[PDB]
């Protein structure tokens, strides 16, 4: 039920990159979309050399507020998909045990669910094994289950176009069968246009010779050679509870 979709993105870019066309298609179909990003917290200059290195790679200068730049990128992108944005308080791995973080994230996701009253929640399956993706996913599974909201896990992009598939779920959980969500040409066009806004991240992901848009078209194509642009998600089955 796509009437009210709440997508939980680990970082500023992940939702658009992975489910952007399905989100666009939901909005075109008359549904309501909100993307909440967990790791969208504030940090102004001055930064650590380790952060300066990541910033320099995004094309940012020492005095520029990076998380602000990225929050602005996220707003521009989501606006093009007709999706609402909500920015979470957590700091990217790069400006900073596991249980305390998951529990903190879960509380905020519960607060977001109560506020947005969604009929469907989405988050990443955490292909690529980023610890922020694992934390976001795990917290979202707990929060959506507590609030009895249906949930799907998406195939992280572009990461899935290069490698893996097998994600390591919490105990007692496994993935249901994968489902391809097909979209029309305008939803795909809107996705790719929205992706251009995350210029900071695309300076790596669509760096010289990265095939990003081609790679994404090819990936979608591999999954359904005859039937246009598509994105993969899975339902979650709980075979065992504590
Ligand atoms: Zn990410």
- Domains by residue range for the chain, with CATH: 1-242 (3.40.50.10320)
Binding site, annotated residues for Zn(2+): 11, 14, 133
What angle, rounded to 10 degrees, do the helices at 185-195 and 212-223 form? 150
Q: Measuring CA to CA, how many Å separate 48 from each of 20, 56, 167?
A: 33, 12, 32
Angle at 22 between CA 17 and CA 24, to 5 degrees: 90
**In angstroms, what is the span from residue 89 Cα to ligand 1's centroid?**
15
In this structure, is the dihedral angle defined by the CA atoms of residues 139, 140, 143 and 145, taken in order, positive or negative?
negative
| Beta strands per DSSP E along the chain | 4-9, 32-37, 84-87, 120-124, 151-154, 173-175, 179-182, 230-238
Please indicate the experimental technique that yielded this structure: X-ray
Helix ranges, 47-168 (H) = 49-58, 66-81, 98-116, 131-146, 159-162
**In angstroms, what is the span from residue 45 Cα to ligand 1's centroid?**
22
Q: How many CA atoms lie within 13 A of 103 on its CB side?
A: 4
**In angstroms, what is the span from residue 148 Cα to ligand 1's centroid?**
26
Angle at 65 between CA 110 and CA 59, to 5 degrees: 110
What is the per-residue DSSP string for 96-117? --HHHHHHHHHHHHHHHHHHH-
Cβ-based burial of 239 (10 A; exposed 0-12, middle 13-18, buried ≥19): exposed
Binding site, annotated residues: 11, 14, 133
**Quick check: 6 and 122 in contact, CB under 8 A?**
yes
**In angstroms, what is the span from residue 161 Cα to ligand 1's centroid?**
15
Which residue in 124, 177, 105 sits closest to 9, CA to CA? Answer: 124
- In this structure, what is the dihedral angle of CA atoms 195, 189, 128, 120, given to the nearest 10 degrees? 100
């Amino acid at each position: 039920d796509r009437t009210r979709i709440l997508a939980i993105s680990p970082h500023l870019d992940d939702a658009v990159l992975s489910v952007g066309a399905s989100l666009a298609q939901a909005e075109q179909d008359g549904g309501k979309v909100t993307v909440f990003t967990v790791f969208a917290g504030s940090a102004a200059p001055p930064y650590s050399p380790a952060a300066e290195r990541f910033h320099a790679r995004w094309g940012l200068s020492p005095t520029e507020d990076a998380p602000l730049r990225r929050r602005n990128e996220d707003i521009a992108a989501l606006d093009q998909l007709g999706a609402g944005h909500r920015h979470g308080r957590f700091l990217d791995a790069i400006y900073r045990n596991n249980h305390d973080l998951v529990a903190a994230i879960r509380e905020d996701i519960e607060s977001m669910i109560a506020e947005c009253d969604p009929t469907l929640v989405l988050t990443c399956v955490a292909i690529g094994k980023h610890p922020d993706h694992k934390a976001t996913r795990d917290a979202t599974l707990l929060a959506a289950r507590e609030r009895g909201i249906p949930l799907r896990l998406w195939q992280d992009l572009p990461y899935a176009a290069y490698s893996q598939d097998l994600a390591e779920l919490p105990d007692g959980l496994r993935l249901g069968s994968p489902e391809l969500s097909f979209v029309d040409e305008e939803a795909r066009t809107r996705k790719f246009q929205a992706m251009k806004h995350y210029a900071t991240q695309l300076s790596v992901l669509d760096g010289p010779n990265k095939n990003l848009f081609a790679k994404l078209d090819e990936h979608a194509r591999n999954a359904a050679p005859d039937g246009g642009y598509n994105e993969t998600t899975w339902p979650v089955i709980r075979y065992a509870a504590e």
